[PDB]
Symmetry: D4
Subunit: 162 residues, 8 copies
């Protein structure tokens, strides 16, 4: 039973969003992946957002580049937490993606993560921390993961070559 | 028969969008004004956009501030030309409004005008020039208007006080 | 039992963060408010973050202006979801607050909301949607709230004065 | 009879503007292409703009990079709708192109599209939607095109490799 | 015989451009002031630029705000040195004025000064230094002026109140 | 007798500044080239600026990247017109170069040209137009050059391949 | 014996730089204040920088707004540590001040603090920490100060009114 | 006895921070290098900062990219001068690194250097100038170094190829 959905406005966003999925694979969290566009498939987005709850999703991670409307439009149609991932656009290096996602006016929110791939991974981690709140097992895996990332740095203090 | 519609995401946008309407009043162009929000009234926006053509609109002028989704969402649902007006937001002085409107990816366009009030007036003028293409009378009024703005500057070359 | 904590780097941030609390009051969600600074009270922040879970918090909302370190430092010390609120700084109008919060590298996330007051309210709404996932009652209040914001716009389509 | 003109300040802009023309080819819309510069061929621009109407153009698409003056200067000389396309400049990645085109003060407008190639295609699509208003056939082709772009996404929901 | 001309796109620019004129008054340099707009009075601008040399102007100072086209259009039509002054716009605080003036592509230049009033004064000073090259008297006044500005600072080293 | 000097803060700036010199070669204008740094050779800069007039220079073109101090420091020490050329820096793509050059406060000016190579060529053209004011021959060559750049565009209107 | 000097390009900078001095007063650190401009008093700056060491200064704090050259020019002439303070400019809100100070190329550094007043205070604190390295007494006062700022926050955790 | 410490948030920062170390090697200044992350190794950072003084460090140079918290967190925990180095991030080219480091509010400072490698070298030079204050020998080496960089430019005035 997938409790988290990863959507994006175009398959060209997959080079970025694959990092969110990679986190779910490492953490063994079931997840659904799909290309949904508020701009190119407006009706499927509405349909998708309206059935998000009945489908069992507790968190939705939406990525888009440029004038990103996907995240906000999904949020406007559901009470399921939506996390936004700014994909790096060619011309404005994701700054346009960032502003169009994070600058939501009062009433409909979207938790936004960093521009690009680091944000893809983080949105998955954030979604995982949200679920772990009521899943002791995942919570344990999440703590194992953090343990690993920390010790990796600790056991490798000197950046210089031997 | 109103051939142009002026929508905005919030009545707080009216302080800006009133300048678009002022142009239509001066040019005697019938127009419809309404607050439609892709974020707060998503279903009314869909309904609105889908019936835009059958309603007789040939141009739509949409204004929004911050992460502006209104313009793009309307454009995604209709073939009626959509002109975007970036409303000046408090924190980013409309830069977030501008990027979220103008940076549309390939497939669904939005002709964007200047940030703020000057853009409101211009979107109305642009819409008027679009209609004048098949309305000799309005075309004449538009030329009278341009004549007036030009001569006003011409007959007042010295900015200094007498 | 407060399941959500609202922290900020300075009481000068309260003029902004009060809007997050206002949402919790309207939605009748118990909440804890406190001024914690990663910069001025580093030890209390560590202590605070480390005991967040044992204290019962399921979401933490942290606001800061300028070079905002509070959100990221709390996130680095706990698995409790952290939502960041960029407070509007004088010189860079919150852009420095925004970048220092949202641009977290891979490993420790922070769901970021809009700059300023609109972001304060939204972070509370987002936190509320996170909790509502396992609280049918709050979920109902959240839907009542959205219903109200939508109908308010619907029953007031003409921005012009009567 | 070409009802739409595509101009640009330099043939170096063609790598970008070719995408506008590609749309007209797909949609079978007659079009004129020409390099006109307000900066390097000021007199030909005036001559060009002044005869735009008598030449039968109903829409003009102008692309320029850097301090783009072409779009605004054409608009100042004709009532024919002008759509601006910000070409990506080396140093400012088209941000200078964008501001010099979209930030027109009150009186002479220019509908601006996205920076770069996506904007080139969109300006053509926008111009096509303007013409389709009084051309049922093109309107039909435009709807066929949108149908195709939408179903392409719909019939390919999973971005992952088989 | 006025050897320097001060033009601007609108009399609303005078609040800024008056500082350029103030320099000429202090330095006793004859000068012509006039509101010329490439956008609102395109033909008068052409006429103006084409006759600049025969009129005796050796330097032209042009100020404009927003998408400033005035400076570049004048430069495109004459060999008389053109200095640009970015007027502070409301929304983008003159950044749009700055980019549209300074970012001229190869072939037609415009020496650009600071945004706002400080730039107005400086463009006049720069123009004065250009003329002083072949005017020993003005050159002397210019050196007297610099002497005065320097000693004013020198004879007042402590910013604190007595 | 070289009437114009081209200086730069580092020989790494030559890849850019060579375009200014190329203009002088085409226009047959004697010129001096030299690497002077306000930061690395402060005393030689002072010495250089103070003797600029006695050396016969009527215009100085200074290029620098990053926090560019060269142009302003030269201007502070001489009455000889100084034109600034923002060299494209790695991190901020010349935006830091641009602001540190153009944003001079009241009293000491610097005519600034576009970021990068296009600005290098233009500063040379601008300097040439300044000299041509009292050199009919160069003025003629300058007009021949403009004639050539214009006709090149005119005789090549179609950007498409034959 | 003043071991730290506070300079600024104009007495108009005092409204900002007074906060640096306020720190020295609280910490009882002798200090010299003076208006020195690289742009308006270039020779006094050279003289000043060259004698900084023989005068006993161990740290220099320089503030400037707009295209700030003061900090860098002082650093180029002395080995005494120079700390830069970006004064908030009207048009670019200190962003131009910031880039012109912090973006120093390799060879001559300037430790830069925050834009505006907070940066003024911090540069003084940083200078104080530099001196405290070889002054146990000041080091003690610095620790008393930090103690006070921390406990002030600690003993006032609830931002709300009683 | 190493009197200066060079830390960074990740070994991926070494490609940049190696330039700081290179300066210490040339100047023969003992130094400690280590990867410390406020985000990934929060406890080791605290431990590290708290023992900085007892370890003999008189200056700390911290580099980080993106939302850089390392510098500020170290500064919050020690009185040892901290110099920040903005590492160039992929998406925002170090602008996010710069703002998150330099924009520290009143109370805890961080002397910030240029974005990237030039800043790495400079922070080392600045730290060296701080130490040289009480080390005549290093002070001499520092002056030898500056002598060399200056004469290198002086003895190579013509950037052109022989
Ligand atoms: N911004 C959106 C939306 C939306 O907001 O609905 N749909 C697609 N996109 C973005 O368009 C960019 C280019 O897409 P293509 O590569 O298909 O041209 C992608 O980054 C996508 O996320
Ligand atoms: N961006 C949008 C949308 C939308 O994109 O659908 N709906 C409203 N808004 C913007 O929210 C801002 C603040 O609105 P309120 O004053 O009601 O808080 C307005 O500028 C509106 O255009
Ligand atoms: N950025 C931080 C941190 C932190 O990151 O720990 N602590 C306080 N601050 C910010 O300092 C700004 C000015 O605070 P003061 O008004 O006390 O000078 C506030 O916006 C606070 O959030
Ligand atoms: N901005 C303008 C204008 C104009 O505004 O009239 N004419 C040319 N350009 C731009 O100059 C850039 C470089 O042109 P070149 O490659 O010929 O140097 C192009 O992007 C063109 O659009
Ligand atoms: N940018 C230009 C041009 C031009 O480029 O020709 N003409 C006027 N303007 C600018 O329009 C702004 C607002 O003018 P108004 O106050 O008349 O609305 C002014 O800053 C003017 O310089
Ligand atoms: N900004 C200045 C100054 C100055 O302002 O005096 N001197 C050199 N520079 C710039 O340093 C950059 C890197 O120089 P290097 O390649 O030698 O590291 C160049 O763009 C130069 O113009
Ligand atoms: N940037 C510099 C320099 C310099 O760099 O030498 N000298 C003065 N200034 C700045 O000019 C601004 C306006 O000064 P005025 O108020 O006298 O016009 C101030 O912020 C000063 O620091
Ligand atoms: N900003 C910080 C912090 C911190 O602030 O504690 N720790 C690491 N980082 C930055 O993360 C970026 C990417 O690191 P990785 O290459 O490991 O993904 C680096 O620039 C590091 O300085």
């Amino acid at each position: 039973p997938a409790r988290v959905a990863i959507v994006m406005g175009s398959k060209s966003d997959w080079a970025t969003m694959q990092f969110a999925a990679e986190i779910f694979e490492i953490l063994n969290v079931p997840h659904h992946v799909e290309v949904v566009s508020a701009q190119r498939t407006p009706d499927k987005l509405f349909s998708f957002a309206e059935s998000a709850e009945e489908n069992g999703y507790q968190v939705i991670i939406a990525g888009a580049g440029g004038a990103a409307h996907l995240p906000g439009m999904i949020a406007a149609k559901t009470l399921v937490p939506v996390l936004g991932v700014p994909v790096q656009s060619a011309a404005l290096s994701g700054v346009d993606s960032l502003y169009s996602i994070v600058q939501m006016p009062r009433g409909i929110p979207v938790g936004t993560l960093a521009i690009g791939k680091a944000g893809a991974a983080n949105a998955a981690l954030l979604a995982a921390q949200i679920l772990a709140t009521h899943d002791k097992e995942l919570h344990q895996r999440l703590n194992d993961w953090r343990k690993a990332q920390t010790d990796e740095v600790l056991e490798n203090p000197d950046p210089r070559g031997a």
